[PDB]
């Protein structure tokens with residue numbers, strides 16, 4: 336019930352600027368990066384389940400779901416990956432923004448393609464192209480469920496979460512910007528998944544809204 340607040344102990348500003356000046360014309364990249372993040376976490380639980388199958392006591396189905404919500408202007412991406420402990424959450428959303436931005440900027444000068452963003456540990460922040468705010472709910476076997484949240488300003492919060500428990504994995508909720516509601520369209524999400532994520536080795540399921 337207690338909220339901790341962290342300062343972006345680098346320039347998340349530098350990262351955000353790089354991302355605008357690199358993908359603002361092709362915002363749809365965010366879905367590719369988020370889906371790819373899920374796949375990595377999914378690989379991790381799969382791998383770990385081999386040495387020790389009780390790892391899957393928290394859930395057997397290894398998959399990714401997309402869930403637009405036009406009423407709430409949210410697009411949510413759920414996976415049953417290995418999830419994140421507190422430390423992993425901070426590490427992956429804080430510590431690695433710093434070193435990852437740096438590493439990526441250096442490679443971009445040396446001439447690397449922008450499509451490499453994922454490999455430098457910062458693909459998640461491409462969500463700030465479409466979303467004013469992002470919430471990340473996550474659960475790892477070796478820890479409690481946590482909610483991370485940030486508007487990409489100078490800070491993010493981490494709190495123990497108390498809403499519906501997932502058993503293992505990560506849900507990213509994007510509160511879209513007024514002008515970016517197109518990513519709530521079934522047709523659009525379809526194009527994107529086909530265009531970017533056809534070779535993801537796990538089922539990606541779009542949950543269509545009734546209307």
Ligand SMILES: CCNC(=O)c1nnn(-c2cc(C(C)C)c(O)cc2O)c1-c1ccc(CNCC2CCCCC2)cc1
Pocket residue numbers: 369371372373374375376377379414416417418419420423427428453454455456457459471504505507
């Ligand atoms: C301690 C082990 N747990 C995890 O690794 C994990 N668990 N869930 N996720 C995860 C994270 C995100 C972002 C919020 C960071 C996500 O959108 C979906 C996820 O499943 C992650 C996760 C953590 C980090 C990353 C980023 N990997 C970038 C890396 C860079 C070097 C090349 C290979 C790939 C992707 C997913």
